[PDB]
Symmetry: C2
Subunit: 160 residues, 2 copies
């Protein structure tokens, strides 16, 4: 049962790539419409959805339309999907990035981070339509694989 405000997903507010009409459903039940033109989204929604009031658009498995978010480069943390059902948590310090969490020990991730629009989530905001459930993040005494080498959790990504 969707409930106003308490059920609401934290939506995206920012630059969009592509123009047209976006459509989504907030977990509260609200249908949110985004009118996108020149990188900017105008939000239409009901009074009962936190997204309507914040001017945000909750991206999820029920999002449709031609546009995609282009997230701001000043993010702190991101969820990066590195295998079919596995995630690494990326922490951005300056221009450097660190794997600070993972869903399973010895998860293999690419040696460099992609552009932020390839992240599943940035600072708690979902960016992708399909995304597997994130398992609880392991942040202690775990390692990740890059090729043949093992790196300790908190390590910088090999290529930087």
């Amino acid at each position: 049962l969707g409930v106003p405000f308490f059920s609401c997903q934290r939506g995206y507010k920012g630059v969009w790539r592509g123009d047209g009409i976006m459509q989504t459903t907030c977990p509260c039940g609200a249908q949110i419409t985004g009118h996108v033109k020149n990188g900017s989204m105008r939000i239409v929604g009901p009074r009962t959805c936190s997204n309507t009031w914040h001017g945000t658009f909750p991206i999820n498995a029920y999002t449709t339309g031609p546009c995609t978010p282009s997230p701001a480069p000043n993010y702190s943390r991101a969820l990066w999907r590195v295998a079919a059902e596995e995630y690494v948590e990326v922490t951005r310090v300056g221009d450097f990035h660190y794997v600070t969490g993972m869903t399973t020990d010895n998860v293999k991730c690419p040696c460099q981070v992609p552009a932020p629009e390839f992240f599943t989530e940035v600072d708690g905001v979902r960016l992708h339509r399909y995304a597997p459930a994130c398992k609880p993040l392991l942040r202690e005494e775990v390692t990740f694989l890059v090729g043949l080498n093992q790196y300790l959790v908190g390590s910088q990504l090999p290529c930087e």
Copy 2:
């Protein structure tokens, strides 16, 4: 919006996640997929090739909690390696080769991902959002893996 001929080529195979998928084919048809045990039951009008072929066209109008889990035994795939750039990968046995790219000097990861990370596999789109694919350049262009450069047609180095 012409029946059969406007139609997008759709996916048929294993899905992960069970539940109800919905999409709109470019012909205008609404197609529903009921996913149970990784298998999809199609419901659609007889005016769409996807109904007639048992397939499900994944695009910007797809909704539902499931995703394709394609067999690792494709021949060619489209791989989105930058915001608006793609590489074409050709598989031969356990080896992969970059056989096309949308711009010269594209950088790509050294390893191909699992197939569900491809935007297209053998002409079947797998991803909901996907930027338009510019013409694929298949000759006299280079791709980069880290600091190393390779001519089109070359194997990906982490193999």
